Each structure stands twice: as C-alpha cells, then as structure tokens.
Amino acid sequence: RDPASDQMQHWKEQRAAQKADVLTTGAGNPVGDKLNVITVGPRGPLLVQDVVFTDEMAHFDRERIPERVVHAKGAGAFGYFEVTHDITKYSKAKVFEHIGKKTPIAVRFSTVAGESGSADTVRDPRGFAVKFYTEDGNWDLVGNNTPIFFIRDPILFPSFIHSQKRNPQTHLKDPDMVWDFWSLRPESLHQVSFLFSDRGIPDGHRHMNGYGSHTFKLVNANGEAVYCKFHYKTDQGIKNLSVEDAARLSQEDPDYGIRDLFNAIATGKYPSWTFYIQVMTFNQAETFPFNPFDLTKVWPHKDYPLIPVGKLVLNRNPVNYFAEVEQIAFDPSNMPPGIEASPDKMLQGRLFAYPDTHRHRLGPNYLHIPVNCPYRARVANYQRDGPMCMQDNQGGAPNYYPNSFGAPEQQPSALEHSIQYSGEVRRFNTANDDNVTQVRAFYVNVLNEEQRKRLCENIAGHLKDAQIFIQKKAVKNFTEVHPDYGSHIQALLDKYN
Amino acid sequence: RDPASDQMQHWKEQRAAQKADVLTTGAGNPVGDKLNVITVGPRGPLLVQDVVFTDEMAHFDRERIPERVVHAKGAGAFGYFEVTHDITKYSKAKVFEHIGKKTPIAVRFSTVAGESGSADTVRDPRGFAVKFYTEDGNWDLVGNNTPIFFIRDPILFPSFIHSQKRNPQTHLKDPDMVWDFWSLRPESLHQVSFLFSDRGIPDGHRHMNGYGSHTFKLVNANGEAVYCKFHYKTDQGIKNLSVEDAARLSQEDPDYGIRDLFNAIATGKYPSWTFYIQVMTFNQAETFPFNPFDLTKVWPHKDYPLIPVGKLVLNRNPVNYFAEVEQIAFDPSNMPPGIEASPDKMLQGRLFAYPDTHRHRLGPNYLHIPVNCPYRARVANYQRDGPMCMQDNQGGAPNYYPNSFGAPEQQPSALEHSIQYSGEVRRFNTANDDNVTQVRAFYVNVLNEEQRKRLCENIAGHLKDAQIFIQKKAVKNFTEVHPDYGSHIQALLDKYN
Amino acid sequence: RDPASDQMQHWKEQRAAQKADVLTTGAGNPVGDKLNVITVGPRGPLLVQDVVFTDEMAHFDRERIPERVVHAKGAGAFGYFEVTHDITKYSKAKVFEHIGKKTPIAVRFSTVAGESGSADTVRDPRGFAVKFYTEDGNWDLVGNNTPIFFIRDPILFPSFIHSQKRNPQTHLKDPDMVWDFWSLRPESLHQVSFLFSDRGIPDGHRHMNGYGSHTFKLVNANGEAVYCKFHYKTDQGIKNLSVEDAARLSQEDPDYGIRDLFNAIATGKYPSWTFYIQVMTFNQAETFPFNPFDLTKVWPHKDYPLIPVGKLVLNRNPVNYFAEVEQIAFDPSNMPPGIEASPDKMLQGRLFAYPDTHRHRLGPNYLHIPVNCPYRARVANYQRDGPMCMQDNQGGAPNYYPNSFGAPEQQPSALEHSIQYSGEVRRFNTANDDNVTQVRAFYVNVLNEEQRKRLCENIAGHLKDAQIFIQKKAVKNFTEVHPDYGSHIQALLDKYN
Amino acid sequence: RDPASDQMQHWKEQRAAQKADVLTTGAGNPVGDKLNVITVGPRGPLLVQDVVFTDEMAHFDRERIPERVVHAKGAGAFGYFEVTHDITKYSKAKVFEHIGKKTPIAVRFSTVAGESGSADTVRDPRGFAVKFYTEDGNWDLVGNNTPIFFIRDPILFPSFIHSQKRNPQTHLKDPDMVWDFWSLRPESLHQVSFLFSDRGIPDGHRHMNGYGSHTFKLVNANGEAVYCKFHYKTDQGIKNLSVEDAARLSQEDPDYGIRDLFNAIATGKYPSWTFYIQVMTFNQAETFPFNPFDLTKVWPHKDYPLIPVGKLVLNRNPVNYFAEVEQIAFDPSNMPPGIEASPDKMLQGRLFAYPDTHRHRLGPNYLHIPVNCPYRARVANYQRDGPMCMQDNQGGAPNYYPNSFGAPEQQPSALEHSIQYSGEVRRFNTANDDNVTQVRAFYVNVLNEEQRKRLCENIAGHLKDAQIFIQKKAVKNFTEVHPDYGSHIQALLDKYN
Ligand code: HEM
After folding, report:
1. Domain total for chain B?
2. Is residue A402 part of a domain?
3. CB B321 within 8 A of CB A171
4. Any bridge partners for residue B281, and if so which?
C-alpha cells in the first residue's frame, strides 16, 4: 500500500526483533493487566484502588484541547529555507545573511471556516504558515494562499469569521450571513473574486502559492528601511480541483490534503517553493495610487518586480501529529531584527491576536512546547513561572531588570525602526477606500473568458440561497466592478430563482 | 424557505418596529464606532487604548472549548417525558410517581468518532442522551441507538476509541487500527454486526431507537430491587439511509441530522419515542445463560417482555446552540433515588469518566451552566468555590458537616439499596465470555437473506483496506459466528484483493 | 462577641422557624448518608459507585483559583456613590449627571506584595479599587492609597513586582532585590518616601485616602476635554499604626483589616470618603514644570485645587467572600463616555494588563460572574461563546456587524476624543526625568522633624540588610533629595551595621 | 551573610568570567530596550506594535497557578534514600532490593490550613511528603509529622478542612467552626491531643518525625503479604518551639522553616531521618483490639517493634522554587510493585483525590513537569495528547491495546495481591469506633505532668473563643478520655470566660 496506510507496519518493522516495552502507568509503575478492571468478585462492582484504570481513563478524558478559532483543519510538515540570493541591502535579518544559509522550518497548511473533521477539498482560502527557527529567535511568516484578504480593518475580523461559520441558533452554514456581510462590506470584492475563481480549491497543498499578504518592513545594517511583500511560488506548479472533483473528494477522502502531503514526502517527492520579495521605498509608498498598507490591494508586478531570495523545502513528515501539528503556534509578532511590521491595520491587529489566542488554546507557556521553542536561540529574560512551566524556569537567575547581578542585558543593535506619523489619533473610516479598481483588472486581465464564466457560475451557485434583497445588493457591487460581471451573475441567479 | 434558513429573518421580524440595542463592550460601555480601529493618523499604527478592539478580539480569541472526546458531532432539542403507565411497583423514582406526570427533558443526538466538522450521515453508532430535570435532581440516561456495545470492560474503551479515530502520526483514518483491535477483541462481534447492518446509518435522529444499553437497578418504596433495561422506540418508525445516499448526503449536507431535527420541530412535527423497560428479578439474574451485566448481550424480548412506562417528546429547538447544546453535559452517575447502577463493568467505569471529562471540557463548576443545572431541585450542600462560581456560592451558610448551625441535612430515605457481594478483589478476565451465540441469532433470525448480503458487503467494503493477516483473523471470528457469515465476507474480500 | 465572630450563630437564628434543607449532590440528588463512604463489608475497600463521595471530593479538589498576581490579600464591601457637586462642565459621564444621583459601587481594599495568607498590618501601599455600576456600563477606578507610584514606565512593572516579592531560588523576601532595583531606579524616590512614612501602615482600610493616581481625561457634552486627577479622602480621618503595633497585630490578627471593615459595617458604622477631582486644561498641561502624565509626580494643591464631586459610602458586607470579593475584577480600561485615558505610559499599560490577567485568573467569561456584571446596562454586541458561557449567549441574535437583521448598533455620541500628537514613534527614555524635586518638597515642607526621623528609621531598618554597595547607592539617591535625608539614613545604617 | 541572603551574589560570582546573556522575548528575539515602551512622541499613547512589552506583560499576568487546596505553605529539598537493612522478606519493591542501594528523592515540608504567604511557625500538623524516583516508577509516600489523623472516613475531609480554614462570609478564622466540628466528631480526640501538645509547633522541618500514617501492604517475591506502617525519625532530634517564640517568629520571619532548611543544606548540615517499618501479619490484623486500618489508631511499639530499613538524606536545595517545589506533585496512588494500599478508608479516598487535584492545579499532563517525571523509568503506554503535551507524545507508536504492531505489553509479574472479601456494599458507620482508649494512653502514660499542663493550656487558649455550648461538648469529650483532662481544661476556660 501507500506510505501513510503502512504507518504502523513500518513502525513495527523498525522495532525488528526488539521485545515490547513494559506497559506502565503515567507515573512509570509497571502494569500487570491493562485488559480487565478490579472488581469485588467476577460480577461485583469496580474498586477505587484500581488506579491503573483511573490513571488511563482520566488522561483519555483530557485528550482534547480547543481547536484553532479559524484554520482548524490542517496538515503539517518540516524542512528548511535556503538563501539563494543576496538581499542584505534591504534586510539585516540573520535568516538572509549569506547565500547558501539554511534555516530549519516548520509549516502548517489549512482551510479556514471548517472545524476539525471537516473536508480538505472545499472552497476557502488556504493557510500556509512558516516558522523559521533562526539564531535571532523564531520568525513566523503566517501566510495564506492569496496576496490579499476580504477586509482592511481588524475590528471587522470576528464578524467576518462569524458570518463564514455556523448560524448561532441552528448551527448550520448560512448563505444570508455570508452574503449579507460581503454585500454590506464591498471591500471584500477583490478576495471574493479570487476565492470564487479556479484557485479557490487547490489540488492539495503542494499546488498553491503562499503569500505574506501584508506589506512588511525590512531594515538593513545602516538603519535604512523599505517596505516589502513576501511571495513563495510553488515549484510543483499551480493545479486546482474542479468543483465536481472537489465535491467527490470531500466525501471520498475528507483528509485529501493531509494524505497527499504525507505521501509526497514519504516517497521522496519533497515539495518546494521559490521565495521572493517585492520592494517599495518610502518615497514610492507616498505615490502609490492606493494605500500601500491596504490588505485588499496588491502591488502590480510590472511596477514592483519579484526579487528572488531563496527556497522553502519540506522534506520531513510529523512523527506525532498532535505534538507537532495540532500544538504548533505561529505568531505574526515573532519577527527578528531586520524584519518589522508595517502600519497595515490588519497586520497590527494580528500582532495582538495570535499570542493572545495561543495563551488560551495551548496555555500561558505555549512557547515551551517543543515545536514552538526557538531552539536555535538562547531564551534569556525576566519572565518566570506560569502553568506547566516545563523548563528549568531560568533557575536562580536574578529576576528583575535592571540589576547589578549579571542577568540578561538588552542589545541596542536590536532596537526597532523609528518613524514619524502625521494626523490625529482616532478612528479613520476606510470603508470607502477603493473597492473596485483592482478587482476590475482581475476580472478583465487576470482571468480569461472561460475563467470568468466559471467564476460567475461559482458565485451564483452559492449566492442563490441568500434572500433576494441580499442577491440584489451583491449584484450591485459586482456590476460596479464590471457590468458583465454583475449581469452574468444575475442571469444565473434568475435561472436558479 | 425552510425555518432553519429563515432563522435571522424570523429574529428580525420578531423585533420589528423597535429600535436596535446599543452596541456595547463586554463591560456595558456604549461603542461609538466598531468598524474602524484607532490609529496614529490615517496610515499609522494601532493604539493600545483602542479597548473596544481588544475587548472584542480577546473574546473572539477565546470562543473555542475542547470538543467532546467522543460524540463530538451532534444536535440538540428539548421537550418532556410523560408517564403513561404505573411502574411504581418497580421504582420509587419521582419521575415515575404518577400517570400523567410530566418532567422537562433535554436531549442530544450524535455520531461517535468524527470531530466537530464531520458529516452526520456516516456509519457509526448514534448517541441519544436524555436529561430529566426531576425534583430529586437530574437523571441522565446517556443512551445510544443500540442495546449493546463493542466491549465489556471499561479499561479497553480508550484503546477502542483510539482505534476508531486518527492514526497518531498521519492523522488519517486507519483500517489496520480499526480491524486489528476488533479482530483481536471478538467480544465486539455483536455490535459490529449491528453497526454494519442497515441501522448503522439511520435517516436522521427521529428514525432510530434509543437504549440505556446497560442493565440498571430499580428500587421501590419497600426497598425491593429488580434489574432493568431502558428502551425508547421511535414513534416515527425505523428508517435508514442506503450507503449511496449516506455518501451523497455527507457531501451535500454534512449537517443533515441537525437540519432535519430543527426543521421537524420548527414545523410542528414534534418527534416522540415510546419509553419501555424490561425487568429481570435477582433470581432470574442468577439463572440467565450469560452474564446479565455483560454489555455485549441483550435480554431476549421473548423472555423479558417490554413493559410500557411513558413517552419522550421533543417540541422545542435550542435558541443558542453553543450555550444549550455544545455545553450540555450528561453524567450516567446522575441517578435519583429509585434508579441505581448495576455491576456492569462498563457502566461502573462511566460513573467516573463523565463528571471527570466534564470538569475538563467545561470546567469545575459545569453544573452551574444553565442547561446543566438541576433547576427543579434545590442544590444545598457543603461544596464551595472553584473557577467561575456563577451563583452566590450558597452565601454565608455553614460550610462543614456535621454542624450545629442549621445547614443542609442528609436524608435517610435517599440511602442506596444494599446488595452483598463475595469473592476475591482482583481483575477477572472476561475476554473469553461468550462472543458468538447471540451474534449467530442476530445474523440468522433478526436479519434475512438480503440484509445478510448487505451486512457482508458493508464489512468487506471497509475491511478490504486492512492487511491480509488482519482480514484473515477477522474472517476467522465471523466464521465462528456462522460459516456463511465468514465465507461470504471472504468471497467479497477475494474480489477486492 | 463581635458581629464577625457571630456570623454562623446569626445565620442559624435567621432561619429558626425552618427545617434544614435536604443535602444534595451537585446535580441535586438527595444524599442518604454523607458521613460514611461505600465499602464492601465493614473493613473492605472503597467503591467507584460511591458517586456522592467523588462528586464532593472532586469539587473540593478544585476549590482554588490563582490568587491575584499583586494585591492578593484583601477585603471587600459594597455601597453607593452619590453626586453632591456639579462637574458636568468637565465630564458628560452619566455617573456625574445630576447632583443627588446615586450609583451602586463595589470596593476591594488590599496590600500589594503579600500572598493570600499574609498579614494586613504590614508596610506596603494599599489598593482601593472602586467599581461603579453605571447605566453606561461599569466604570472601574482602580486606585491606591497614594497619588503616585514607584515607576513611570509599565515595562518595568514586572521587574519591580519581582523585586518586591520572593527570591526565585530561596522563596524568601530579599532586601538585595528590593534595594538594588530602587537604588538603580531613583524615580522611585517619591513613592518610597511615602511608603516609609507614617502612612505606610494605615490603621485599617477606613483610615486612609484613595487616589486614581494617574492623570485621566474628562470630556464634556460639547466635545471639550480637560485632564484630571481623582482623590477620595477618608471621612473617618487619617490614622496609622506604629511599626510596633503593626508588628504585634501581624501576629495577633493577620486579618485585622478584614475584621475591622466587616465589624464597622455590621455595627452601622458605614465608612465614607469625599470624592474630588483636580482639573488641568490642555494649556496648563503645556506649562506644567514636569510631565503631567508622569506617575511619580503630583499636581500641587495650590496650583490645582481639589474640586468636590461626591461621596463614596460602604454600607453592605459581602455575603460570600469568594464569590463577591475573591472573584471581583476591576479593569482600568472600563471607562464610560465622558471619562478617558491620558498618555500616562503606566495607565496605558494597565489598559491591557487587567482584562488580560482576568481572562487567566478567572476565565474568558469573567464579566459574567455576578459581581463583575454591568447589571445596570444591557450588554449587547457580537461577542459569543467561550468557556463557562453563563447566560443565553445572546440567543439567536445575528452575530456579525454590520448586518441587515436588526442586531445592536454603534452609538456615534460615544466616540472617543481626538488629539494630535507630535514626535516619532519610538521608545523615549524617561529614567532621567526629575526624580528628586517633589520628593524634597515632601521631606522639607510636608513632614515635620519627628516624621522625618521615623521615615529615616523605617528606611534604615530595612535597607540595613542589603549589601553595602547597595546601601551606598541608595543613600546617594536620598542625598540628592536632601543632604539631611541621606546623612540621617547613613548615620542609622552605621549604627545597624 | 548567610547562604540564603547571598543567593544573588553567589549566582553573580559563579558567572564572573562571562558576559551577560542577550535579553530576548519569549520567542528568542533579541530586545533592544526593555526599559521604555513605544509611544507616539515623548508624551503620546502606547502602541500595539510594542510586542516586547506585551510578550513580557502577558506572561507576568499569568504567573500564578492555584495554590494547593491544603498544605499550601511549604519548603522543598532533594537528596536520596539509602537501604541499610534487608526487608526483602516483606517487600519485593525495587527501592529496597539490596543494602547500599540509593534512590533519588524529592521532599516537600508544609503546614496545613494557612495559604501561601502564611507563617511557618504556627500550630498545625506538618506535611512530610517523599517522592522516590525508582526503576519501577515513582513511589510517593505522602506523610505527615504524625502517625494518625483527625478523622477515619474521607467523606468528612472536605468538611474538616473547611472548619479549619476561613469563614465563608467573613474570611476569618472561626473558633466556632473549628470546635463545633471537633466536638461533634470525637474521633478527632487522638490527633487533637497530639496537635495541642509540644510537638504542635516543631522547630523547623529538620526537628520533627515523618510517618506514612496509614497501614499499607507489603508484598514479597513469593506473593506473600503483610501490613505495615512507615516511620521516619529525625536524626537531628525532636525539638519544638514554645508558644511565645513561635508567635514572635511568626511576625519576625513567616518563612522560618524555608530559611532554616535552605541554610542547613547550603552549609553542609544535611538533615537525615532513620526509616523504619512496623509489620503486622494478616493473622495479627484479625486479632488487633481496634480496626488496624483506622487512621486514628497507632500500633503499640511493644507489640509491633520498629524494624530499621534505611535513611532519608536531604543534601540539595531547589534551584528554582516554583519549578521544583510549587509545581511538585505527590500521589499516594503512585506505588510500585511490592507496595500496595490497605482497606483504610482515608487512604482509599486519597488514591482518587491527589491525581484529581493535580489535574486541576497543574494540568492534565502534570506528570510531564520535570520534577514530577518518573525519570528513572521508561514511561510507555497508550495515553496520548492533552493540553501542554511537552514530550514527543510517544511518537508514532500504535496507540491501542491490544495490538499486533509491537507496542507496550502488560507485565504479569506486576499484578496486585488478591484478597477475598464478603459483605454488603454500603456505608458502614465508623463514628462510634473507639475514640478515647489510645488517647488516654497518650495523656496518662506518654506525657508527664508538665506536658499535660501545657496541652490543656494550649487547648483552652483557643477553645475559649468558641461558644459556651461548644466548649461544654468539647470538654465532655476530653472528660471521657480522662476526668483530669477535661477538668483541667474546664478550669482554664472558667478563668478565660
Ligand atoms: C466504559 C465505556 C465508556 C466510556 C468510558 C465513555 C466515555 C465517554 C466520554 C468521556 C464522553 C464525552 C462526554 C462529554 O464530554 O460530554 C462520552 C460521550 C458519550 N457517550 Fe460514552 N463512554 C462509554 C460508553 C458509552 C455507552 C455504552 C454509551 C451508551 C449506552 C455511551 C454514550 C455516550 C453518549 C450519548 C455520549 C455523548 C453525550 C452528549 O451528547 O453530550 N457511552 N462517553
């Protein structure tokens, strides 16, 4: 059979002639019989002194932890990032310091709305998070398979996600929720167009691109900074599943993406992605026709060419999924010297959200979990204690800063980039920023006739279940992007209605 | 559209002609703008003083709680239990005190192995838990849609569940795990035969029966006791889904069971079940040909006739699914005077497991969550504090027993029934108890030729993916039940292989 | 005896004409005998079916929750706030709406460094937090018994607290930690001077003042803003305990403050405080000699006169301490319209810290705990679920914003005050702001000779246990405040050494 | 100064020849400035992008975990147990296999009622828990400084502890609660007598004995069993503190016990205890005049002589108290082959309670915490996952038992000892077992007149604050032990009242 199916057989074969280990309780006490409980006589009641039973059952009763609030369904793999080009003129980050430099990486792919147990081959964006274990600590590039997103302000994120998930009363998917939100928030037009196109359902994780999406900031050795976009293109080529094949596969194999990735790596077909960056100077940022920090916008390639940096290669499968994949945590705020945040409101919100949700989902000391540990860096600070403190807790080192006793010292070279911002400190409305121009270019130039047809068919197929008033407003938005876009969807809706 | 689809529309209409509430933070502070965050100028970074954002995001980051270790995918409804017959000669429980007596109930239906985003229409047993809010506290009859189970000793439960779930490394379903366990533990033959028959995939929750499965004990007003089995048969009739339709539905509508139940209740088609009991005297328990407390055995209806008791009616849908369904907790140990446990090893283990897992999944004070509260009884005791103590914690009442200050007193009439047991206190092996006799009767008499054909096809369709040595041992067990059972499966496996 | 001692006797008497409640399990099942466990025969082992035992023991095993990271030892009480003067020209907050308007309040007093079982009468600042349950949600004024604090930047807070607590290895109080930090961070001179003065150990909670400490912002109906300080002076008069009496009481009655407050309220001696504010216009903020938002500075009374506002009255004792006091949570970020944060770096950090620690200490849904509920306001928003969701979770109301289904709407009038700030976004050092001027005024003008004598004796009595190099550095700081301050301390240290 | 005081100085000196480590965030990113936060200009608000601040503050906000429900205040140390005599004829436990065999141990000493922060030198029993890291897993002998306890049934434990702690309304110690419980439950007479004697306040942890208290069962290589009692007598000699000195020290140094133990070990004065066992054959258990499994009874030395076994030596202090002491967990149920529980109801209850409370206080995977790890044993089983899974989670090993893939196997030689029982499974009352005989022997034969006088004085000094009716019932109990015991106490009470 395939490698995945033969997991146990292979584990057995590796043991070879070795005698089985002694079965023990959690406290390491050998177990005499773990197949029958202790009772008063053959047909008598169970005894409390059967600690073997309680020890095992109590742990079984505690196996589950909360699934991720979004991107719950996924797959993971490990490998490395290798620098192929010199971009030190832009970033001083150690991960990019020299051509040929390899940094270990951990990756998790995922859908967005579905819970654990949902199907892999469904229309939804795809998470493509990368953890770089650098000497300057971990760098988490928490990307998606799209360069943009549905909204441009983080305060609408919980609402958007709610609208994409289950109705609070019925617990069912709700087309009224989905489309009422999107039609009321037309900034979503760009990503909705990409979502409903062919790339809405990639053929597994190896056949899609990855993007940082947000504009980030790079700082060099001289303290000079530029803005950038991260891109990682699949070396296996873009490949998508038709709506029909995706539907069939969601029933035949809900874990299609997990299986495909595991088997590819197990057979030596290590997937790779070519890593690039787009660079925009501060001067160019002032002249960009849109807000360069607006997540619903892309930086046109003809104006901001992709610059090659390196390669991402996945060549190792997880040994224990729960420990290495379910428990892995990526924080966009994990950025080493040379890489910083941009003023993108969405990115700014994410700086808070991830460590926050991880403290809840995993625990206060989630960074102690092996897969999350910045193992290629010495963690030395003034943080102590907390639940499940699994390391030496920094021993007897002086726990306050500053101190006259030789404890860890701050490193001035690691100081962040200083910038002057103008304007009042308040809430600035961005609902009316451009919501259609780049979407028009996508519909007209990025897609061809047959792709536009499928796009309209995909949208109408889902939108038809929303109330007419919602259908009307959604169509009004599409029409504003392009009359052909709106009219084609309307014609399909008429047929359905 | 259907009621479920129109949930929001109906909520809106109910409010109609009245102003929307003021949007507030969790602390009740009115929100001026919850659509834009506070930034340093229109293109500057986010401020910590945007508490509206953090307050909302922090809660979003904490929405998820651990799903149930088993039976994670489900649907809920509410209604009542009504006594139709007098069984006070068997049980003094207040829930049965008089004909016509109505007791409010809460019910949750579910599959077993699949996680929260899995499909409803798959082969698996179905949970059918009933919470009776009685004057003597809550009585939780945590049943399944089958009168039996796969194993007869609780220490094997975690292992059985593990074998039914995901491979620890690949995170994929594993036929080797499933069948290695079942073939090595032939006591599973009886329930495996039922599982792979037509009733393995019921047409929604309204078309299946419910059973307490375990033998329980009933105690009357005179202190006399008998053993019993609880049965609740569908008044809507047994109806199943073909493998083909179940497969199609798992893709078309993974929430088929949830939708079906909600819409039935919303349209006034309240589903009901006729509640019965079988009674076995202590004398009969001594002469029963098998262990009457063996969960892999049924009490033949010819020898132990069904005695009608009342009816279960579900006439109310949940208003908020998370609060009323995801958070509901059923403990088999919640039994009021008149109903007690039997020596069934499986039941004995469950007495511990449920409250234990609930303290983890929900929290130490999970009984304080509205849907879990014994609202028709006054909780008065010496228990105090704990996380999220959401009631006045019994005020200033003396917190130790005994006391001379008028605090709660034990009630002699609530004392449990006493039975004498003799024998060595040790682990008694039950692996070699009868594993085939009742299974033969099911295969030969309960099923007919066409049903036996489908049973063998369903088993072979799944078992064919397990290694040959596993298929062989499995077939050996089936052959022991009946040579036709094993040979038919083998013939089908021969084709597949 | 005193009211506190007679708590149980009074509880008993209050229900003399009633029979005791029936003792039940957590699920409301009546208990027959809660004085003996179930065993097989008189001297046989314990049975798992003794669910009465497990239910009670399991809850006992979960009684404790984490104590507050700081201010762990405290006392609580309830009452009201009454407006007595009109300050609507400064703040539009509903709590100040009309003279005569009463608002319910909850208060918690506490020490700072000591854990839960520590003594009340010890040198340490005193917490004086006030929760106002207003119609515009809860307003939490989390003050101390001092107008200033030891540091002026929140990032040094964890270090400061660590220095004040136990050595990480020995778990003992450490004078080297205390004074190494204070001597290296001389901005602490002002509050250290207050701390070691006679007011360092107040005679209970009723004989001390309360202050918001931080500069806050008030906004009126016209959108005009001013900066303010909150002061609440004791109507019972300032009264302190001598070092000797405090030491004796810490042994005789570690709960002196708790007992004193309870008995005063129980005997009708309701303690009260007169509430005032200081006002500083934005223009005055420009001319202030120091940073008006520097927490180590006060606003001189002659320059900024106290303006009376109202009264704080405590007239109700807690019924259950754990539920109403141990579980109470105050968040400085809970500010209703009309009251806002100032740029005080320390306050800014607290905006994040409290809700954050509360989600940990109490739980994600801590605002649903009765005492923390903004019961005078209707909480309506788009937040849902989370562990121990204790209400109907807002039912079936649409859960995303914006929506076309009548769910909660934002209120523009509640929009925050806009301000333009100048300067780069970076880390500005404040270690070198003035650390001695206001301290000199306190030493020279506020204190008299005998008070200066005790201040020096109190400091020297503790500082004498720190290493000589730490003593030298500390004295150097005190000398900069005033040569007598340092020399008197040095003279005493020479004596101790 | 003393070693404890010079902790930081020594840590600094040990690293004199090294540069300080680089201060990093939790994720290992170097910190440029951890003394000032990022603001909008020098007097502007705080930015969310100051991740250094949030990362540190969020951890500070989560430092605390629930303190132990009982025995919260303590001290810890490490060392070894060395076998000096051969008791293999009684027990096959590997910890006793041969003379000269050393097993690493971890010890925690403590008081009982006081919270963390309470004083060490107060009247209360003292915990003396010993963790033996053996090849057969961990063996936890969770003893006290007394051979007996206040009660003989575990269901009264939560009540007893409640009566010993704070009043639920006032949060104060309550003499009425303490004595109402003790007077109503006279089985407490024996331990109350020990508690109020000179040994009620030992001079530190090194000057007191340790006892397993309960009767345990020892099983040898031939499967033969005997009952036993564990005793570990101080080699430093019994030394107690007077009521006066204890009171003064409770104020001068609440951490007297912690300091004393740390300095003793730091200076090379390693404390030791001589380990003994008492042996009672099953025949003798049948003839014992009292219930040999009654926790309020001792086995007289003349009839059951102490048999030397080995030595407990503490020669290593904790490096980090929180990690090694606050987080240490002892489970009485952690018993290796050769050591088993007896029918003692109290012990039976503790088999459940400890692992249960640990899953709450520390977490589901608390056995993963370094100090709790059975590091001298290979943990191999079918347990998986759970929050904070800090190990490899047993990799890809088959997770179900039985299995055909070479995973861990039960060890028949680890099977527990079988004993036959016969009796009703019910609640047998033990309130009326002998409550005075052994107490009389203590009062009359063990103590002298000088000691009896202090015993009566210590009791009366506390009992005087309980109501008169409680004083009378308590005195009636003491009178039943001996008329002089009651009359002397009554005389002192008369003087006090
Ligand atoms: C020794 C065997 C068993 C053990 C240890 C066991 C354990 C569990 C556990 C730990 C849960 C999760 C509970 C929660 O998180 O709310 C569960 C759920 C469930 N089990 Fe069992 N179970 C066993 C046998 C059975 C049997 C024989 C039945 C039926 C007669 C059954 C019916 C159910 C149902 C219906 C649920 C879900 C209840 C709900 O809807 O919330 N279980 N079981």
Report:
1. 3
2. no
3. yes
4. none
Residue D379 included in any domain:
no
C315 catalytic per annotation:
no
Cβ contact B40:A293 at 8 Å: no
If you ran DSSP here, which 8-state letter would residue D429 be given? Answer: -
Distance from CA of D176 to the nearest CA of C (A): 8
Domain at A81, CATH number: 2.40.180.10
Specify the CATH number for the domain of residue B37: 4.10.91.20
Query: How far does Cα D379 stand from its chain's mean position?
Result: 25
Range D481-489 contact pairs with CB under 8 angstroms and sequence separation of 24 or more: D481/D189, D481/D193, D481/D436, D481/D439, D481/D440, D481/D443, D482/D440, D482/D443, D482/D444, D484/D452, D485/D443, D485/D452, D485/D456, D488/D452, D488/D453, D488/D456, D489/D456, D489/D459, D489/D460, D489/D463
Bond into D387 cis (ω within 30): no
Cis peptide, bond prior to residue B402, ω within 30 of zero: yes
Q: How far apart are CA C217 and CA C226, in angstroms?
A: 6
Report, as residue numbers or ranges, the catalytic residues of A.
71, 144
| Selected catalytic residue, list D36, D85, D144, D497 | D144
Domain presence at residue C132: yes
Strand pairing partners for B422? D422
Q: Using the atom order of ligand 1, give the atom closest to the CA of residue B212.
A: 30
For residue D33, the distance in angstroms to the closest alpha carbon of chain B comes to: 19
> Which residues in chain D have their CB less than 8 angstroms from residue C173's CB?
255
Question: What's the 3-state SS for C179-210?
Answer: HHHHHHCHHHHHHHHHHCCHHHCECCCCCCCE
Cα–Cα distances (Å) from A57 to A156, A388, B181, D31, D128, in that order, read 42, 21, 18, 45, 29
Number of residues in chain B:
497
Domain extent, residue B23, equals 1-64
Length of chain C: 497
Interface B–C counts its CB contacts (< 8 A) at: 372
CA distance B320 to B77: 11
Ligand 1 centroid–CA D385 distance in Å is 19
Specify whether D270 is located in the same domain as D358: yes
D94/D175 same-domain check:
no
Angle at D452 between CA D451 and CA D458, to 5 degrees: 90
| Dihedral angle sign, alpha carbons of residues C224, C230, C235, C238 | negative
| Chain centroid to CA D249 | 23
Check pocket membership of B74 for ligand 1, CB cut-off 6 A.
Answer: yes
B341 in contact with ligand 1, CB cutoff 6 A: no
Could you tell me if B272 and B213 lie in one domain?
yes
Give the residues across from D240 on adjacent strands. D202
Q: List all residues 6 or more positions away from B17 whose beta carbon is below 8 Å from its beta carbon.
A: none
B314 C-alpha vs ligand 1 centroid, how far in Å? Answer: 21
Mention every residue, 6+ apart, whose C-beta is less than 8 A from residue A351. Answer: A332, A333, A341, B46, D48, D49, D51
Is the minimum distance from the CB of B256 to ligand 1 under 6 angstroms?
no
Choose among D337, D92, D98: nearest CA to D220: D92
Closest CA to C254 of C117, C92, C144: C117
CA D323 – CA C171 distance, rounded (Å): 12
Q: What type of residue is B16? A: A
Coil vs helix vs strand at A229: strand
**∠ CA C60-C66-C71, rounded to 5°:** 130
**B77 lies in some domain:** yes
Pick from B45, B48, B360: which is nearest to D364 by CB? Answer: B360
Three-state secondary structure readout of D278-343:
EEECHHHHHHCCCCCCCCCCCCCCCCCCCEEEEEEEEEECCCCHHHHHHCCCCCCCCCCCCEECCC
Regarding beta strands D272-280 and A272-280, do their DSSP bridges make them parallel or antiparallel, or are they unpaired? unpaired
Q: Are residues A24 and A82 in the same domain?
A: no
CB D450, CB D242: distance < 8 Å: no
Cα–Cα dist C452/A46, whole Å: 72
Catalytic residue selected from C71, C205, C207, C231: C71
- C-alpha span between D494 and C294 (Å, rounded): 61
